[model samples]
Target: EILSKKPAGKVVVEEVVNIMGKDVIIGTVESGMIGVGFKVKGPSGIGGIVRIERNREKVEFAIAGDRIGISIEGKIGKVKKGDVLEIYQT
Candidate 1:
């Protein structure tokens, strides 16, 4: 299962370029001993999944069993017609 957490990155000029409309890359976590895969989907990007990594490996699962949220960098607290969403992984 995937465990969700708050986003720790903020907006950067390079990361937000042409990134106000589509599903762009954001943050990611590898599979771990106690994590699950989750998807976040919604009008403003909901049903996205989270995964955990362990020993340089990622855990594979079909569900997330926690109430977790993520924050993207430089998302001006507004949604527009051409704004894109991003996921992060490090």
Candidate 2:
């Protein structure tokens, strides 16, 4: 079934990071939902996987309201400030 409902929350890109030579998009979670494999859609419907930072290595889960980063190479290039981020469960 389609997970038809309001977006979990609106996320704001706080900073772009390069962890372990990989591009990471750090942002703040507005709503109270988000987890591994979740898709983040931004302007133009562009989105990618949600990867959380775990010390030196990156993981695939993060809690809501906490700052987290995503590893979506080339996809996050179009992201910008004031852009609203929508989360999706895949």
Candidate 3:
């Protein structure tokens, strides 16, 4: 059997950026994190790896329990602010 943990915290989408046909989500982490290799559940029940990272000037894994920016790898249509970002560890 395997064990799983609950989401560390909740975050609200602050901004969405369109970079080279990709949507990068910017939000403030309430408590937990869904970093690289982990999956993230966005608004509309969309679940996938947002590929959160700590790179704005450098490359790093996305941090938990703080405000950060991330890039979602998939179809993210019309993501708006106030949307909840659910993080899950993998």
Candidate 4:
């Protein structure tokens, strides 16, 4: 279940690391725990700029391989085993 102003026709969710108050875009990996992985590039880096608004109360998250993880470095979050991440884009 996702909330958005306009409907997302195409989504590619995967798995990755993240934390509270942190902003990220789901990515995917060739073959990993969450199936795919996300991007780890920031504004300075040359990568896709995808923005996602997550509710602080939300618990679960789906990441993608192409997703470029962005935000303050450190232990913001992690993508463990046995997880289902999704991405929606049209």
Highest lDDT: give the candidate number: 3
Per-residue lDDT over 1-90 for candidate 4, one digit per residue giving the tens place of the 0 to 100 score: 223333222233344444584535443422322212223322233122234333432322233333333232323234333333222221
Error of 3 at 82 (Å): 1.0
Candidate 3's residue-wise lDDT over 1-90, tens digit each? 102467645667888788997778788776655555455655444445545554354334545455677776666457788887666664
Candidate 1 ranges beyond 4 A from true positions: 1-35, 41-43, 60-90
Candidate 2 clashes: the total is 0
- For model 4, what is the error of residue 19's alpha carbon versus the real structure, in angstroms, after optimal superposition? 5.2
Which structure is stronger by TM-score: 1 or 4? 4
lDDT of 3: 0.62
- Name the regions of candidate 2 deviating beyond 4 angstroms: 1-3, 17-23, 54-59, 73-77
lDDT of each: 0.29, 0.61, 0.62, 0.32
TM, every model = 0.21, 0.64, 0.65, 0.23
Clashes of each: 41, 0, 2, 34
Question: Superposing all C-alpha atoms, what RMSD in Å does each candidate have to the true structure?
Answer: 11.4, 3.9, 3.8, 13.3
**Which scores greater on lDDT, model 2 or model 4?**
2
